[PDB]
């Protein structure tokens, strides 16, 4: 009989400290309204590792389920974006999206090369990405390969290999297929069953 | 002009949200003064997992090395405390101290019975504690056993099995043996070499 509210927000572009504030604001709003879940439509090529780590940790302490939805078709959750997804309660991908490609780099060089992260830093990131996968019951071998092979997956590959939970064309199909699934990580110590049966979708806007 | 300062603070008792604020304050001070390192003398039986995670993450984002020093003799870094230690740049233990015993438990039942965390939550903690070990080059098999066997180690066992870096009777011996070692986790992307040859020790007091 109660109304379930699902918020939807959009995060696009490079992950920066400002992106942290965006996730913080959107998630805080949704928590304050006792939302059933917040869906974050993500499209990013990556960004700063530190802002990623704070975003991951914000989601993990979230009092409501955060669903990372790689969207619209043509979007990716690449590099840092992949960690945001793996750190979340549920991952959905639209057809024609991409996840992965997390080979850690320091940047572009002086002259004719890319600057690869040294092996130790790379192993650090491998340990971290694998932990997000193991914590959420997702494929840690594949997660490692996002780094070691610069592996990138389509939605159907990502579903088949146990990296994501839902492939969905839009918000309404996401709600329909996600309905009745458990969060892959705890929300206040419990693996909550998502209830999307009569839900009010509300869009949160920037400015 | 530029001096080589090491701060020392003390954190005792249960880990709570207030313990987070203590680590936040002490570390912020030391970062604002461009300290070489902050040593936190830690004695805890454990506490809240969420406060532990925010403490761990505060240490990981620290702009200066954080050394967790299980001290004074008789002290322990048990349960949540073990994770604070594993999440840190360097671990030292005084002789007669203890680390480990992290079997996640909910409390006691209607009967006097110890309530074990359900298996999924346990596995979540295993994935997390192993990640802190792997990220810092420390023994992840032993780290897992802190949970699965409720394993507790003395300083000398912990050093021998590759869980800690230093056994030290006091601040001065800690400085001496720690001098010239690399941090076990990065400080903003670099593994810093600790320089303690000539250093000004300053004690931070609780407000």
For residue B13, the tally of other CB atoms under 10 A from its CB is 12
Looking at the partner chain, which of B121, B127, B135 has a beta carbon nearest the beta carbon of A134? B127
- B81 Cβ partners below 8 Å, 6+ apart? B15, B42, B44, B45, B46, B47, B99
Distances from the Cα of A35 to the Cα of A10, A30, A79, angstroms? 17, 5, 29
Q: Which residue of A has its CA nearest to B63?
A: A50
Q: Which of A83, A126, A189, A190 has the highest number of chain B CBs within 10 A, making it the mutation to test binding with B?
A: A189
Distances from the Cα of B96 to the Cα of A141, B156, B157, angstroms? 40, 9, 11
How many angstroms away from the CA of A59 is the closest CA of chain B?
Answer: 12
Question: DSSP letters along chain A, please?
Answer: -PPEEEEEEEEES-B-HHHHHHHHHHHHHHHHTT-SEEEEEEEB--B-HHHHHHHHHHHHH-SS-EEEEE-STT-EEETHHHHHHHTSSEEEE-TT-EEE----EEEE-SSS-EEEPPHHHHHHHHHHHHHHHHHTT--HHHHHHHHHS--EE-HHHHHHTTS-SEE-SSHHHHHHHHTTPBPSS-BTTB-PBP--SSEEEEE----
CB contact under 8 A, A186 and B121: yes
CB contact under 8 A, A186 and B61: no
For residue B194, the 8-state DSSP code is P
Report resolution in angstroms: 2.2
Under 8 Å CB pairs connecting chains A and B tally to: 47
CB contact under 8 A, A124 and B186: yes
B107 touches chain A (CB under 8 A): no
Q: How was this structure determined?
A: X-ray
Residue B40, domain extent: 1-207
Q: Which of A51, A63, A124, A191 has the highest number of chain B CBs within 10 A, making it the mutation to test binding with B?
A: A124
If one counts the domains in chain A, the total is: 1
A168-177, Cβ contacts within 8 angstroms, sequence gap of 24 or more: A168/A69, A168/A92, A168/A93, A168/A94, A169/A73, A169/A94, A169/A95, A170/A94, A171/A8, A171/A39, A171/A69, A171/A201, A174/A39, A174/A67, A174/A69, A174/A92, A175/A6, A175/A199, A175/A201, A177/A92
A116 touches chain B (CB under 8 A): no
CB contact under 8 A, B185 and A127: no
Residues of A in contact with B54 (CB under 8 A): 57, 61
A18 touches chain B (CB under 8 A): no
Domain CATH for A196:
3.90.226.10
Handedness of CA A11, A92, B61, B74 (dihedral sign): positive
Looking at the partner chain, which of A50, A128, A189 has a beta carbon nearest the beta carbon of B135? A128
């Amino acid at each position: 009989l109660a109304k379930n509210i699902v918020y939807v927000a959009q995060i696009k572009g490079q992950i920066t400290s400002y992106t942290y504030d965006q996730f913080d604001r959107y998630i805080t709003i949704a928590e304050q309204d006792n939302a059933e879940a917040i869906i974050i439509e993500l499209d990013t090529p990556g960004g700063r590792a530190d802002a990623m780590m704070n975003i991951v940790q914000r989601i993990q302490q979230s009092k409501i389920p955060v669903i990372i939805y790689v969207y619209p078709p043509g979007a990716s959750a690449a590099a840092a974006g992949t960690y945001i997804a793996l750190g979340s309660h549920l991952i959905a991908m639209a057809p024609g999206t991409s996840i992965g490609a997390c080979r850690p780099i320091l940047g572009y060089s002086q002259n004719g090369s890319i600057i690869e992260a040294p092996p130790k830093i790379t192993n650090y990131f491998i340990a971290y990405i694998k932990s997000l996968a193991q914590e959420s019951g997702r494929n840690a071998t594949i997660a490692e390969e996002f780094i070691t092979k610069d592996l990138s997956l389509t939605p159907e590959e990502a579903l088949k290999y146990g990296v994501i939970e839902v492939v969905a064309r839009d918000i309404n199909e996401l709600l329909k297929k996600s309905n009745g699934m458990k969060t892959k990580i705890p929300v206040n110590g419990r693996y909550v069953t998502l209830n999307f049966t009569n839900v009010e979708v509300r869009y949160l806007a920037p400015s």
